Design a protein around this ligand. Structure first.
Ligand SMILES: *[C@@H]1O[C@H](CO[C@H]2O[C@@H](C)[C@@H](O)[C@@H](O)[C@@H]2O)[C@@H](O[C@@H]2O[C@H](CO)[C@@H](O[C@@H]3O[C@H](CO[C@H]4O[C@H](CO)[C@@H](O)[C@H](O)[C@@H]4O[C@@H]4O[C@H](CO)[C@@H](O[C@@H]5O[C@H](CO)[C@H](O)[C@H](O)[C@H]5O)[C@H](O)[C@H]4NC(C)=O)[C@@H](O)[C@H](O[C@H]4O[C@H](CO)[C@@H](O)[C@H](O)[C@@H]4O)[C@@H]3O)[C@H](O)[C@H]2NC(C)=O)[C@H](O)[C@H]1NC(C)=O
Ligand SMILES: *[C@@H]1O[C@H](CO[C@H]2O[C@@H](C)[C@@H](O)[C@@H](O)[C@@H]2O)[C@@H](O[C@@H]2O[C@H](CO)[C@@H](O[C@@H]3O[C@H](CO[C@H]4O[C@H](CO)[C@@H](O)[C@H](O)[C@@H]4O[C@@H]4O[C@H](CO)[C@@H](O[C@@H]5O[C@H](CO)[C@H](O)[C@H](O)[C@H]5O)[C@H](O)[C@H]4NC(C)=O)[C@@H](O)[C@H](O[C@H]4O[C@H](CO)[C@@H](O)[C@H](O)[C@@H]4O)[C@@H]3O)[C@H](O)[C@H]2NC(C)=O)[C@H](O)[C@H]1NC(C)=O
Lengths: 13, 207, 207, 13
């Protein structure tokens, strides 16, 4: 799954 | 004689796959008479060749500032690979070498706890929203605040302090209008660190 | 040539009438050929004579360390008086003068708020008691913790951080066995600053 | 009045 900071892609496992 | 300073990439650039981290080899006190500077980059001893030289900059104090930038791979940095920059110039009897890499030590996941303002504070103009980020290693981290998906810029974060267990902790304080907090508005503490799942976690704070 | 470093008194020594604050003029890199050093002290330009020289100390790196200590009056320091130390030595082209005094700016009283551990932290073996000290000026301060009149040494305090209003704030974290917290034990955050009534204030925290 | 830190006299106004 992924993580987003203010719309920006942070990281995905 | 020239001096050299090797800088690590920004925490946010190493933790976000949407950004490009880089190591910067800065050479100061470069002379006007011999500004030709040769750079040799190594990654764990193996010489690499994809570095670029930033445009030369006159410092106005009789010297130039020559800089080389090396792009790194997120995983290479996070995996503790060592980057060495060798600087050669005619005014240098022998080449200067600096080495930098991530801090060595088992990475530990930060625990993030949001703390509401004190009852005693409910009488002032603005209240303080606290975010305690503790138990993390290494100290490379990024902490920000937001509300309704919008970034809140009115905060100050203490530098990381070394705790008694070999980990780091810090506190971030966001200052807002009592009205906002009173109204039930939702505020959040965004933390980015390599040891977090997906290098990310948010902690909400409201009533 | 020798080098000089002038240090201010400890915050606790200036804020407690039961202690004796002092300014310390340290001279390093003193040579064996010429170890004799003359000191001239001044307070707002007026030369004073009650300073004492600490016993000379061999540094083992080919130099001595010569130190002069001047006792100051609590009120003189707190009132912003300037202390100047002049150092003279035959290996020095001209006497060296350093000046130090309290930070200038209107003193502001620190607001102290105790913050309990996050309910989420109860799953851990030990918990964090926070103490927010904000809105103070100057940064000279002393923060400690206690319980039942006994001092609690298991804490870490962030260095003062400059806030957006020109004042300073910091956070102190005391870590205690979860059992102690859940049992109703009362803990207190003791803060000492010149702008507080009687330079002291204590704020308690319990379940 | 006065203030005391762990028994030690701090200050008195
Ligand atoms: C001639 O003039 C030169 C320029 O002077 C002018 O600039 C001002 C800064 C003043 O110096 C002023 O006098 C002038 O107006 C002058 O150069 C300076 O020389 C110093 C001594 O040789 C040197 O000191 C070292 O500084 C290190 C820290 O430097 C950083 O931080 C300062 C400010 O905090 C900043 O000015 C520097 O530019 C450095 O900033 C970092 O820059 C890097 C690279 O750009 C950034 O990292 C990258 O950033 C990019 C984006 O930009 C990407 O993100 C990339 O991924 C990143 O890698 C980084 O973000 C940025 N950080 C900050 C905070 O800004 C110290 O670490 C170093 O300390 C070590 O060594 C000393 C001994 O030397 C020890 O005492 C220490 O304990 C420690 O071990 C040291 O203090 C200055 O850096 C240098 N300034 C510049 C601009 O180059 C030169 O000396 C003059 N010479 C003469 C003869 O007069
Ligand atoms: C030869 O050896 C000399 C001795 O060094 C020994 O230790 C190592 C260095 C070994 O390698 C070995 O050489 C020796 O065994 C060596 O001297 C050093 O020289 C340095 C550079 O010249 C000098 O650096 C400056 O340090 C300042 C800070 O000093 C304090 O902190 C250091 C480190 O924590 C500490 O070692 C010092 O003793 C100082 O400590 C403070 O001392 C004061 C005064 O006693 C205390 O205050 C009083 O405390 C009493 C206690 O009862 C009362 O409370 C009273 O009321 C108080 O007033 C204070 O508490 C204490 N603090 C701490 C934290 O311990 C920096 O300020 C300074 O940096 C500034 O200035 C430079 C230049 O302008 C700038 O570049 C900086 O940016 C900054 O602006 C600078 O870094 C060392 O201090 C000095 N070490 C000692 C012990 O004196 C010498 O150089 C060697 N020479 C050769 C050729 O090899």
């Amino acid at each position: 799954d992924c993580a987003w900071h203010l719309g920006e892609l942070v990281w995905c496992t | 004689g020239p001096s050299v300073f090797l800088f690590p990439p920004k925490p946010k650039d190493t933790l976000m796959i949407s950004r490009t981290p880089e190591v910067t080899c800065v050479v100061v006190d470069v002379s006007h008479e011999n500004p030709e500077v040769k750079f040799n980059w190594y990654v764990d001893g193996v010489e690499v060749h994809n570095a670029k030289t930033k445009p030369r900059e006159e410092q106005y104090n009789s010297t130039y500032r020559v800089v080389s930038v090396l792009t790194v791979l997120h995983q290479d940095w996070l995996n503790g690979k060592e980057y060495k920059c060798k600087v050669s110039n005619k005014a240098l009897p022998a080449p200067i070498e600096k080495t930098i890499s991530k801090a060595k030590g088992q990475p530990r996941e930060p625990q993030v706890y949001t703390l509401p303002p004190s009852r005693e504070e409910m009488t002032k103009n603005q209240v303080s929203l606290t975010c305690l980020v503790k138990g993390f290693y290494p100290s490379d981290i990024a902490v920000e605040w937001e509300s309704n998906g919008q970034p809140e810029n009115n905060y100050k974060t203490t530098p990381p302090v070394l705790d008694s267990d070999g980990s780091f902790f810090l506190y971030s304080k966001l200052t807002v209008d009592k009205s906002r907090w009173q109204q039930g508005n939702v505020f959040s503490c965004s933390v980015m660190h390599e040891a977090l799942h997906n290098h990310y976690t948010q902690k909400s704070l409201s009533l």
